[PDB]
Amino acid sequence: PFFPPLYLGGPEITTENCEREPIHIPGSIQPHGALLTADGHSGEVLQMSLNAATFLGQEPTVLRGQTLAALLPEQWPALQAALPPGCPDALQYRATLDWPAAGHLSLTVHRVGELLILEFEPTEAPHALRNAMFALESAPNLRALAEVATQTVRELTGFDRVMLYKFAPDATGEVIAEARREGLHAFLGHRFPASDIPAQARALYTRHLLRLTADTRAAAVPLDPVLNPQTNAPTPLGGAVLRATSPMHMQYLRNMGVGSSLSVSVVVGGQLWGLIACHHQTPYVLPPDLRTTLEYLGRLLSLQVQVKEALEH
Amino acid sequence: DPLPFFPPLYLGGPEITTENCEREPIHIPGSIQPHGALLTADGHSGEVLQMSLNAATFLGQEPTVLRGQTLAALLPEQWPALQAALPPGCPDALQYRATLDWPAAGHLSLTVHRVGELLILEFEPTEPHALRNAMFALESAPNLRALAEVATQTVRELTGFDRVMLYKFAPDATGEVIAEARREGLHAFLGHRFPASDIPAQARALYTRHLLRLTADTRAAAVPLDPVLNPQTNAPTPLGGAVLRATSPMHMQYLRNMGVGSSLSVSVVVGGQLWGLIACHHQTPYVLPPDLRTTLEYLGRLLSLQVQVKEALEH
Ligand SMILES: *C/C=C1/C(=C/c2[nH]c(/C=C3[NH+]=C(/C=C4\NC(=O)C(C=C)=C4C)C(C)=C\3CCC(=O)O)c(CCC(=O)O)c2C)NC(=O)[C@H]1C
Ligand SMILES: *C/C=C1/C(=C/c2[nH]c(/C=C3[NH+]=C(/C=C4\NC(=O)C(C=C)=C4C)C(C)=C\3CCC(=O)O)c(CCC(=O)O)c2C)NC(=O)[C@H]1C
């Protein structure tokens, strides 16, 4: 099963109980964005991140009464149609708001049962993706495909290190390709135990295909209330990219000297084949539109891995 | 019966009839569609060899001036990028794309690929979260039918085409429309089936490697290359990989007879085989700009993946 989260007086995690940390329900988010939850029917704002006032520019109480209808007039009917009752928690809808306080915000919404989860992040506003797609497809074998993928991602993102991290049948991990800035350790060829990415992390990564820690030293921002009014239970946040990273994994990243981390799942035959894993030495908020490019690349790599593995077997 | 290609018309080959379809050499027509321009150049020196006859009007230069310069001089910023992206021996399927600001012609999209020692350069005029939203909707579709319906509707919304269909090949190469989105008033093709020869075997082979082709105006005359043969080889210039390549006159007549002014299909490729086509129709001529066509190319790949996934959920 899972332990209760901390804020419901559950045990603190150790290396004795890696597998049982309820990483999906931390009750908090990373501070480079803001999150609101809301009722599926009424559009009634039920929870907000204590930092919402910053991003939205709204007097705190104003929000926690109001309706999405009021708050987002153009958007609220689109949401209603895009995310019908009963849809999967994996389905997401995005829009760009030109919002008074903040030039442009990206809005990302998904639905978990009766709750809409809304994420707001700063945003903005060429051929590198098309060029990359063809490059991946003409790679002659899996090894070269891995090399092209890591190089392409590094060029698109500027990340200090990009790896392709492949799982063995026992969930032992191996770094089979790597693109990195001069003057970093090489992790190419190294293998790591399965407990570095615990089973409950791997399952969540099979369904929700991108996560990140923008700053491995930033404090999480609580949800208020912490419990969902609807249920008097924790809000599931695993489909939210803003979700606070496990402090065990942030300790792991800090001990490695990483300041910013991001990965994309490569899913083949319904299973987690591996990860595009990125490191930055310093804090780094990759903007939403560039993340989208990596999300596309994730799908394309999933296709090409199967194609390429089929021409060996 | 499968038989080798005839020589093209310009090398004294015969004219194509219903008798001998599968032998038209549709990859070497010696000509392009008039809404863009094409140059060929030597892959090592960058000497310009062939050009479409309309090139002066896209590129704003006399032929003899174009042909008298190397790509190093014509494309000083792109020439080194081309050479890195398209190394000798690379496959003909690999494409490099850039946007140019050309004085006379505005923003041009440049698409380049390499066939042996030849570079092929295509120039076309070029111009929010719809793709991301579509990607997730496709993935959440519960079964093959719902996927097919979401895919057709999405493509129609992105493009404005009068008719978008998902055409699926059977094992005997006969095809069947299995989903479609269509303009009000058009008659339905859903559930109809069509003989294997409607798309002959040399087309289906080419459609497994080069995943997007089009006819922007089914009445437009083709524009010859000049000279027609590659001076490197005194042989035909391979245009299988060029979206500007002239469509087969047999196929344009099949389309005009249907009342179609514009056609476009994306290949859906599963396990190395052509599974089906996203096929679109418009009643009037219609040019879809290169950046919009890129969205369809990306959806072609997504759909190939999702078709595998939906079919595996099915035994
Ligand atoms: C008690 C359990 C421990 C634990 C937990 C844990 N680990 C993750 C997630 C990740 N761990 C990763 C590990 C590596 N990154 C590398 O670069 C290398 C090798 C050079 C390794 C072995 C990775 C890539 C992830 C994915 C996330 C990311 O991209 O940063 C989680 C889940 C984090 C979250 O989503 O909140 C958890 C709980 N890690 C341990 O080392 C043990 C002690
Ligand atoms: C004597 C040979 C004939 C022939 C040749 C031919 N056909 C193609 C390619 C295509 N034919 C298509 C046929 C259909 N379009 C539809 O809408 C339907 C059903 C509603 C069918 C059956 C299609 C879709 C294509 C693909 C290209 C496209 O999307 O327009 C070629 C190759 C064309 C080229 O690449 O230049 C050739 C030579 N078709 C016949 O019917 C016989 C008479």
All structural domains of chain B, each given as residue ranges with its CATH number in brackets, are 1-125+219-247 (3.30.450.20), 126-218+248-315 (3.30.450.40)
Question: What would the 3-class secondary structure string for A149-215 be?
Answer: HHHHHHHHHCCCEEEEEEECCCCCEEEEEEEECCCCCCCCCCEECHHHCCHHHHHHHHHCCEEEECC
Longest dimension (CA), chain A: 61
Alpha helices in chain B (DSSP H): 55-59, 63-67, 71-74, 79-85, 130-140, 144-159, 201-209, 249-258, 290-312
Strand bridging mode B175-182 / B163-169: antiparallel
**Distance, in angstroms, between A164 CA and closest chain B CA?**
20
CB atoms within 10 A of CB A222: 17
Interface contact B132, partner A, CB < 8 A: yes
Contacts of B91 in chain A (CB under 8 A): 138
Calculate the alpha carbon distances from B290 to A72, A208, B43, B123, B240 in Å: 34, 32, 24, 10, 18
Closest alpha carbon to B28 in B42, B14, B43, B7: B7
Using a 6 Å CB cutoff, which residues line ligand 2?
A: B 18, 21, 24, 26, 175, 177, 189, 194, 197-200, 203, 213, 215, 247-248, 250-251, 254, 263, 265, 277, 279
**For residue A150, what are the contacts with CB-CB under 8 A and spacing of at least 6?**
A162, A163, A164, A177, A178, A179, A276
Give me A132's structure tokens.
């990359």
Nearest to A130 among B97, B302, B305 (CB): B97
CA distance A123 to A32: 11
Strand, helix or coil for residue B123: strand
Q: Which of B90, B97, B99, B297 to mutate to test the interface with A (most CBs of A within 10 A)?
A: B97
A92 touches chain B (CB under 8 A): yes
In chain B, residues with a C-beta closer than 8 Å to the C-beta of A300 are 301
B269, β-bridge pairs: B274
Distance CA A197, CA A249 (A): 9
Q: Which residues lie across from B277 on neighbouring strands?
A: B167, B267
Determine if residue A198 is left, alpha or beta; phi over 0 gives left, psi from -120 to 50 gives alpha, anything else beta. beta
Structure tokens, B292: 């919009």
Chain B residues whose beta carbon lies within 8 Å of the beta carbon of residue A135 = 85, 94
- Assess A313–B contact: CB distance below 8 Å, yes or no: no
Chain A interface includes B97 (CB < 8 A)? yes
Please tell me whether residue A114 adopts helix, strand or coil conformation: coil
Kindly give the residue spans of alpha helices, DSSP state H, lying in chain A: 52-56, 60-65, 68-71, 75-82, 128-138, 142-157, 199-207, 247-255, 288-310
> Whole-angstrom Cα distance, residue A13 to residue A246?
10
Q: Say how many Å lie between the first and final Cα of chain A, rounded.
A: 38
Asked if residue A30 has its Cβ within 6 Å of ligand 1, the reply is no
Nearest alpha carbon, ligand 1 atom 16: A277
Do B27 and B239 contact (CB within 8 A), yes or no? yes
Confirm or reject: Cβ of A205 under 6 Å from ligand 1. no
Elucidation method: X-ray
Pairing status of strand A271-280 against strand A161-167: antiparallel
Q: Nearest Cβ partner of A94 from B91, B129, B301?
A: B129
Q: B42: which 2 tokens?
A: 């030597």
Residue B21 marked in a binding site: yes
Q: How far apart are CA A69 and CA A148, in angstroms?
A: 46
Closest residue (by CA) to atom 21 of ligand 2? B198
Q: Is the peptide bond before A225 cis (omega within 30 degrees of 0)?
A: yes
Which 3 state secondary structure label does DSSP give A22?
coil
Which chain B residue has the Cα nearest residue A132? B96
SS percent in chain B: helix, strand, coil, step 5: 30, 30, 40
**B163/A167 Cα distance (integer angstroms):** 44
- Cα–Cα dist B158/B20, whole Å: 38
Rounded CA separation A205/A24 (Å): 11
Residue nearest to atom 1 of ligand 1 (CA): A18
In this structure, are residues B81 and B126 in contact, taking their beta carbons and an 8 Å threshold?
no
Q: Ligand 2: distance of its center to the CA of B283 in Å?
A: 16
